[PDB]
Amino acid sequence: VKEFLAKAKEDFLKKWETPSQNTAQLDQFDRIKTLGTGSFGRVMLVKHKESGNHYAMKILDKQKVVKLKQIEHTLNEKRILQAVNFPFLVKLEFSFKDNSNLYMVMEYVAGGEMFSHLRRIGRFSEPHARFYAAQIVLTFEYLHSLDLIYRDLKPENLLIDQQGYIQVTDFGFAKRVKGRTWTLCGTPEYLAPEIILSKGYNKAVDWWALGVLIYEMAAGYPPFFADQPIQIYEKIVSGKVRFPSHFSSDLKDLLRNLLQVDLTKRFGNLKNGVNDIKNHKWFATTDWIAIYQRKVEAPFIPKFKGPGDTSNFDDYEEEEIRVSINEKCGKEFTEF
């Protein structure tokens, strides 16, 4: 591992220094159907004319970006996404912009969000949750070693591929930072105490979010929930967590070390780093190299009828993509 990562960092650095730009144009694609929306953008299933391939295109209205003050965040998203390369990270194929929008064309992950399957089924058995969790652990190990922080881990940002493996999407809050950062961003249910308390935080927040993820997958509901975000923040800060009767002793022990309000005791943030997590009993049966190589037989494989099939995604109200005749926010997005 120590060896591998060191070589992937070199690749990342070259692309981080000299990012790719304007690698395609809107007219090379046929817009088909909306796969999902969020706070910032809309993601559409598109077909590439010349090749016939299907992709997932994230569309960002430049004006909406400024209004919401996501300028720096959006620039981070594109810059980081085009520089990374990992089995469990969605791949950015092309990126370009026009008078009104910013575009990011990614590989189409047809399996749907883990969210939809999780909600429909109710919850995942421990071995099933472990399978997904192992992939996130490796993903964060790769990301952190590049000085990157994810900041928006949640089932809504995790896609299942044809082989039943995870593909992490949405790098909207990803940031390269050595040291601490202060932005209050993320999703309510997954915020670490230190973020809410506005004290400056580091990569340790991703490890806390993993805790919440594992908990939600195994239980079927998040550890801290309520009707309004403010009520949730109160629960997160208290640190009081209750485990379902069915959780195994190993799982409970792992979660107590991830959902640790104290940074000096939180797994992943100690001397052994990620090793404390990898060597934990709950992962005793996990073959880390096998997962990385995608040699493990996935516990769940989504039904998929031909390319272009969106049956694993909900339906959304379609909206015309408008392109003004005048250039908007030209200077702000120069490097995009």
């Binding site: 706070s39 996501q70 969000e113 909600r119 209050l184 993320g186 999703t187 509901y221 009707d227 209750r242």
Partner: peptide, 20 residues
Amino acid sequence: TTYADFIASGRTGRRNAIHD
């Protein structure tokens, strides 16, 4: 049950990120 309280809550659907 905790599950019943969750299912009756207002945050069982897709959750968007925090934007100010």
